[PDB]
Each structure stands twice: as C-alpha cells, then as structure tokens.
Design a protein around this motif. Structure first.
Motif, PDB file in Angstrom:
ATOM      1  N   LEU A 198      30.783  30.283  65.788  1.00 11.98           N
ATOM      2  CA  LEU A 198      30.307  31.264  64.943  1.00 11.98           C
ATOM      3  C   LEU A 198      30.505  32.608  66.345  1.00 11.98           C
ATOM      4  O   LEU A 198      30.116  32.910  67.005  1.00 11.98           O
ATOM      5  CB  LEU A 198      29.337  31.188  64.479  1.00 11.98           C
ATOM      6  N   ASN A 199      31.762  33.562  65.030  1.00  7.53           N
ATOM      7  CA  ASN A 199      31.865  34.478  65.769  1.00  7.53           C
ATOM      8  C   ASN A 199      31.631  35.470  64.245  1.00  7.53           C
ATOM      9  O   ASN A 199      32.533  35.883  63.576  1.00  7.53           O
ATOM     10  CB  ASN A 199      33.832  34.768  65.823  1.00  7.53           C
ATOM     11  N   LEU A 200      29.788  36.042  64.441  1.00  5.20           N
ATOM     12  CA  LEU A 200      30.086  37.312  63.331  1.00  5.20           C
ATOM     13  C   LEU A 200      31.056  38.510  63.288  1.00  5.20           C
ATOM     14  O   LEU A 200      30.962  39.139  61.844  1.00  5.20           O
ATOM     15  CB  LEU A 200      28.743  37.989  63.716  1.00  5.20           C
ATOM     16  N   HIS A 201      31.915  38.822  64.207  1.00  7.92           N
ATOM     17  CA  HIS A 201      33.211  40.089  64.056  1.00  7.92           C
ATOM     18  C   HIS A 201      34.139  39.133  63.334  1.00  7.92           C
ATOM     19  O   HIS A 201      35.409  40.036  62.933  1.00  7.92           O
ATOM     20  CB  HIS A 201      33.949  40.032  65.875  1.00  7.92           C
ATOM     21  N   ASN A 202      34.141  37.685  62.282  1.00  2.91           N
ATOM     22  CA  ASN A 202      35.301  36.926  62.242  1.00  2.91           C
ATOM     23  C   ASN A 202      34.919  37.324  60.709  1.00  2.91           C
ATOM     24  O   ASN A 202      33.575  36.916  60.302  1.00  2.91           O
ATOM     25  CB  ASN A 202      35.507  35.841  62.403  1.00  2.91           C
ATOM     26  N   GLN A 203      35.966  38.364  59.690  1.00  2.38           N
ATOM     27  CA  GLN A 203      35.037  38.186  58.539  1.00  2.38           C
ATOM     28  C   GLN A 203      34.394  36.923  57.494  1.00  2.38           C
ATOM     29  O   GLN A 203      33.765  37.040  57.019  1.00  2.38           O
ATOM     30  CB  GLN A 203      36.039  38.926  57.750  1.00  2.38           C
ATOM     31  N   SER A 204      35.128  36.076  57.959  1.00  7.73           N
ATOM     32  CA  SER A 204      35.508  34.426  57.153  1.00  7.73           C
ATOM     33  C   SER A 204      34.348  34.251  57.468  1.00  7.73           C
ATOM     34  O   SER A 204      33.387  33.826  56.867  1.00  7.73           O
ATOM     35  CB  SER A 204      36.190  33.372  57.586  1.00  7.73           C
ATOM     36  N   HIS A 205      34.131  33.861  58.901  1.00  8.07           N
ATOM     37  CA  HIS A 205      32.593  33.556  59.731  1.00  8.07           C
ATOM     38  C   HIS A 205      30.973  34.242  58.871  1.00  8.07           C
ATOM     39  O   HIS A 205      30.086  34.237  58.614  1.00  8.07           O
ATOM     40  CB  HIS A 205      32.584  33.780  60.908  1.00  8.07           C
ATOM     41  N   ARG A 206      31.742  35.542  58.421  1.00  6.80           N
ATOM     42  CA  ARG A 206      30.583  36.575  58.514  1.00  6.80           C
ATOM     43  C   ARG A 206      30.034  36.078  56.764  1.00  6.80           C
ATOM     44  O   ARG A 206      28.877  36.196  56.461  1.00  6.80           O
ATOM     45  CB  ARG A 206      31.235  38.339  58.730  1.00  6.80           C
ATOM     46  N   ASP A 207      31.710  36.218  55.670  1.00  7.42           N
ATOM     47  CA  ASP A 207      30.725  36.123  54.796  1.00  7.42           C
ATOM     48  C   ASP A 207      30.464  34.469  54.824  1.00  7.42           C
ATOM     49  O   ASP A 207      29.602  34.401  53.759  1.00  7.42           O
ATOM     50  CB  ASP A 207      32.673  35.618  53.834  1.00  7.42           C
ATOM     51  N   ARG A 208      30.839  33.773  54.943  1.00  8.47           N
ATOM     52  CA  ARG A 208      29.376  32.430  55.157  1.00  8.47           C
ATOM     53  C   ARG A 208      28.346  32.908  55.649  1.00  8.47           C
ATOM     54  O   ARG A 208      27.387  32.000  54.958  1.00  8.47           O
ATOM     55  CB  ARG A 208      29.990  31.409  56.652  1.00  8.47           C
ATOM     56  N   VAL A 209      27.857  33.468  56.837  1.00  4.48           N
ATOM     57  CA  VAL A 209      26.307  34.021  57.174  1.00  4.48           C
ATOM     58  C   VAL A 209      25.961  35.007  56.064  1.00  4.48           C
ATOM     59  O   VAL A 209      24.635  33.966  55.707  1.00  4.48           O
ATOM     60  CB  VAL A 209      26.745  34.717  58.483  1.00  4.48           C
ATOM     61  N   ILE A 210      26.347  35.028  55.074  1.00  8.77           N
ATOM     62  CA  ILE A 210      26.021  35.894  54.285  1.00  8.77           C
ATOM     63  C   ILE A 210      25.866  35.504  53.020  1.00  8.77           C
ATOM     64  O   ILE A 210      24.964  34.862  52.245  1.00  8.77           O
ATOM     65  CB  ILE A 210      26.809  37.155  53.599  1.00  8.77           C
ATOM     66  N   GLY A 211      26.764  34.037  52.982  1.00  8.65           N
ATOM     67  CA  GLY A 211      25.836  33.279  51.225  1.00  8.65           C
ATOM     68  C   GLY A 211      24.772  32.750  52.049  1.00  8.65           C
ATOM     69  O   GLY A 211      23.922  32.127  50.689  1.00  8.65           O
ATOM     70  N   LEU A 212      25.517  31.916  53.390  1.00  9.60           N
ATOM     71  CA  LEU A 212      23.487  31.149  53.444  1.00  9.60           C
ATOM     72  C   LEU A 212      22.467  32.438  53.628  1.00  9.60           C
ATOM     73  O   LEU A 212      21.658  31.464  52.875  1.00  9.60           O
ATOM     74  CB  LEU A 212      23.920  30.552  54.912  1.00  9.60           C
ATOM     75  N   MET A 213      22.555  33.685  54.003  1.00  8.97           N
ATOM     76  CA  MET A 213      21.826  34.222  53.635  1.00  8.97           C
ATOM     77  C   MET A 213      21.331  34.810  52.097  1.00  8.97           C
ATOM     78  O   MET A 213      19.987  34.650  51.295  1.00  8.97           O
ATOM     79  CB  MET A 213      21.639  35.414  53.677  1.00  8.97           C
ATOM     80  N   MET A 214      22.205  34.322  50.985  1.00 13.13           N
ATOM     81  CA  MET A 214      21.922  34.284  49.710  1.00 13.13           C
ATOM     82  C   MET A 214      21.422  33.748  49.332  1.00 13.13           C
ATOM     83  O   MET A 214      20.242  33.062  48.328  1.00 13.13           O
ATOM     84  CB  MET A 214      23.160  34.487  48.538  1.00 13.13           C
TER      85      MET A 214
END
Ligand SMILES: COc1cc2ncnc(N3CC[C@@H](Oc4cnc5ccccc5n4)C3)c2cc1OC
Ligand SMILES: [Mg+2]
Ligand SMILES: [Zn+2]
Length: 305
Positions: free
Chosen positions: A192-208
């Motif tokens: 998991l790499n929060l600098h990678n936009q596709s991974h960051r989009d997943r973490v925001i989806g889980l936040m949602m």
C-alpha cells in the motif's frame, strides 16, 4: 455559534448531532472551517448551498438530511485525527461529498429500482442511486450563487468534482467488498502506497464506507435507535417487493423481524468488523470506530442470549 458541550463532544467519534435540525448547518460550517480554514468558503454562498442540499433530501426514515450530516461528521472526526495525511482540497471535497452522498434518496435500494424498471436504472445501470446522487450534487453546484468552488482554478474545480464523484460512488456498498479485499492484500504484502493515486482512491472509498456505516460506531443507545430507522426503510422496500410479486430477502421482510439480532450479527461479522479492522490498520487513530463497533457486536450478542 457552538455551544460549549458541542464544541467539546464534536471531537468524539461517537458524537450524535442531536434533534435540532437548524443547528446542523452551523455544525457542518464549523467542521469544514476547522478542517479547511475559514477562507476555504464564502459564508453566504456556502450557507445557500447547504440549504439547497437540505431541500433535496427527502423525509424518509433513515437516508435523510440527518444521515447526511452524521456521515459528514464521522469524516470530520477521521480527518481531524489523521492530521497531515490529506490535502486541503481532499478535505473539503470529502466533507462536501459526505453531505451530498444520498441526495434525493427515496429510501429504496438499487436492487428495487432495477426490479421496478425505474427510469434511473436505465440511465445508470450500475451504482444507480449513487450516479444520481452525484448528478444532483453537480446540478446544485450549477444553480446561481451556489458555486462554493468558484474561487478554485478550472483545473482544481475539475479535480475536486472528481474527488467528490469517486467518494459518492464508493458509498455503493456493493463496491466495498472488493475494495476492502484489495486494501487488505496491499496492507499485508506492504505494497500500500498513499502516494499512488489508485491506492489513495481506495483508502478514501474505505473512509466513505466507514463513515456511511457509522451508526454501528456510536454508543449502544444511539446504535439501537438508529437500527429502528434502517429497518423502517428496508421493511417498506420489502412491502414494495411483495407488491411487485417478488418475495423479499429476509432483511427486507417485516414478517421476519424476530430475526433482526441474527441479521445484525451477520452484518457486523461480514461487513462492519472487517471494514473498521482494515481502516484501523491503515489509519491507526481511527481505532475508536473499531472499539465502538466491537462493543455493539457484543450488545447484539447479549440481545440474543
Ligand atoms: C447496522 O445495520 C445495517 C446498516 C446498513 N447500512 C447500509 N446498508 C446496509 N445494507 C445495504 C444492503 C445490505 O448489504 C449487505 C451486504 N452484506 C451483508 C452480509 C451479511 C449480512 C448483511 C449484509 N448486507 C444491508 C446496512 C445493513 C444493516 O444491517 C442488517
Ligand atoms: Mg447511499
Ligand atoms: Zn448514506
């Protein structure tokens, strides 16, 4: 301006926003000002926008304006406890997305719209209600005097609308299973790499997801009362399935209401517990959401005994 009790308790993940509707706009303004500075938005425009959002939520039992401001509050609490991870523009996009994410919900699922053959399901064949919620948000932003993003550049406007569209679509809980499965694998392989936009989009989806489900992270009296409202809509939808000639699944069948505790156990085990476990692994300061959820699982286990 915020009463002292609320200025204090608003920081708790298990804050409940109370029964005074007219206090909720100010609660939302306070949160978005605390997360995004006070220049973030012109107060008059943002006030106009919030009232128009409120007006396009319906008076249904659960997916109403109170649910919208509650889901925004949980996001506020996640962002406040994860200082420096998300950008100012992400923080504003995500609070706006939460306030807007069930615009014009009528209290029926995508599955019922599909079986009914509703016109929205021909327009948007997957994530039907969520594509509509995002369509409503853009329509509201397009009303005179409602463009709360008018001071962004065109590029940053397009970027925040994209943050909002992806965050709203991620509230389609059908998408959560596969999202959380991918995140868990990334977490565990250390990829998991929060600098990678596709991974960051997943973490925001889980936040949602975590924010949309957050009734199960309040204290037990709130969680139990909220479950009344959630079943009120599901049972209304189950009545409408029966009227189309389709037997509803048990969760939507008011004749199966004695099985509520067992259904809650299913949900917590399959969806809520894994959701908050994965979120806590990625953002450790969200741990209070998981602890509250486990306490509520133990309460449902008590109701069964
Ligand atoms: C706190 O109570 C809640 C809260 C919800 N909030 C938002 N959407 C919900 N749903 C959407 C479709 C359904 O989705 C699903 C998905 N997967 C499962 C697995 C096991 C049991 C139930 C499951 N349901 C149920 C529930 C359902 C629910 O408890 C029964
Ligand atoms: Mg929704
Ligand atoms: Zn919702």
């Amino acid at each position: 301006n915020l009463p002292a009790r609320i200025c204090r308790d608003i920081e708790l993940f298990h804050f409940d926003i109370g029964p005074f509707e007219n206090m909720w706009p100010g609660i939302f303004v306070y949160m978005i000002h605390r997360s995004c500075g006070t220049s973030c938005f012109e107060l008059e425009k943002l006030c106009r926008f919030i009232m128009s959002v409120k007006k396009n939520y319906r008076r249904v039992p659960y997916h109403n304006w109170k649910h919208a401001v509650t889901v925004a509050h949980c996001m506020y609490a996640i962002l406040q406890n994860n200082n420096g991870l998300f950008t100012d523009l992400e923080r504003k996009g995500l609070l706006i997305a939460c306030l807007c994410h069930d615009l014009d919900h009528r209290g029926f699922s995508n599955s019922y719209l599909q079986k009914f053959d509703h016109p929205l399901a021909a327009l948007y064949s997957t994530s039907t209600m969520e594509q509509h919620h995002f369509s409503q948000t853009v329509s509201i932003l397009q009303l005179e005097g409602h463009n709360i993003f008018s001071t962004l550049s065109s590029s940053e406007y397009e970027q925040v609308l994209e943050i909002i569209r992806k965050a709203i679509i991620a509230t389609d809980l059908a998408l959560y299973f596969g999202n959380r499965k991918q995140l868990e694998e990334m977490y565990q392989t250390g990829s998991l790499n929060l600098h990678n936009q596709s991974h960051r989009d997943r973490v925001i989806g889980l936040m949602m997801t975590a924010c949309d489900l957050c009734s199960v992270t309040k204290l037990w009296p709130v969680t139990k009362l909220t479950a009344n409202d959630i079943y009120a809509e599901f049972w209304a939808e189950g009545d409408e399935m029966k009227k189309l000639g389709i037997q509803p699944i048990p969760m939507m069948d008011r004749d199966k209401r004695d099985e509520v505790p067992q259904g809650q156990l299913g949900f917590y085990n399959a969806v809520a517990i894994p959701c908050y476990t994965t979120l806590t692994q990625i953002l450790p300061p969200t741990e209070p959401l998981l602890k509250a959820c486990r306490d509520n699982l133990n309460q449902w286990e008590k109701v069964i005994r």
